Write a structure and sequence with these properties.
This is part of a larger assembly, with chains A (50 residues) and B (59 residues).
Chain A (H helix, E strand, L loop, with lengths): L50
Chain B lengths: L32 H25 L2
The chains are: A little secondary structure (50), B mainly alpha (59).
Subcellular location (chain A): Host nucleus; Virion
Protein name (chain A): Hexon protein
Family (chain A): Belongs to the adenoviridae hexon protein family.
């Protein structure tokens, strides 16, 4: 700061402590119901995926 | 590759008011144009009475 301020790099970061990350298995990432739409999507049902 | 990578890394704007003082105004203006005529009238009246010396000395 001031008239003699030194040339400077700007650094950016975040914290998100008590959380646990989530990725809903739903076609549009919304909680439309507990049994999701993709969980009913009977392509990826009976003919089982790795 | 690692260690530091956890965080992240013109011409003319043409101002005008600068570092001078404040300013004020008032509306009681302008007798002054009369004296320019006062001065040049009375100046003639000087010469007019210099002439009145000469025009009496010449008699």
């Amino acid at each position: 700061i001031g008239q003699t301020a030194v040339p400077s790099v700007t650094q950016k970061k975040f914290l998100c402590d008590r959380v646990m990350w989530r990725i809903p298995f739903s076609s549009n990432f919304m909680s439309m119901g507990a049994l999701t739409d993709l969980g009913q999507n009977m392509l990826y049902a009976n003919s089982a995926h790795a | 590759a690692a260690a530091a990578m956890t965080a992240t890394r013109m011409p003319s704007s043409g101002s005008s008011p600068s570092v001078p003082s404040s300013i004020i105004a008032e509306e009681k203006l302008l007798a002054l144009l009369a004296e320019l005529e006062a001065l040049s009238r009375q100046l003639a009246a000087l010469t007019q009475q210099v002439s009145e010396l000469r025009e009496q000395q010449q008699q």
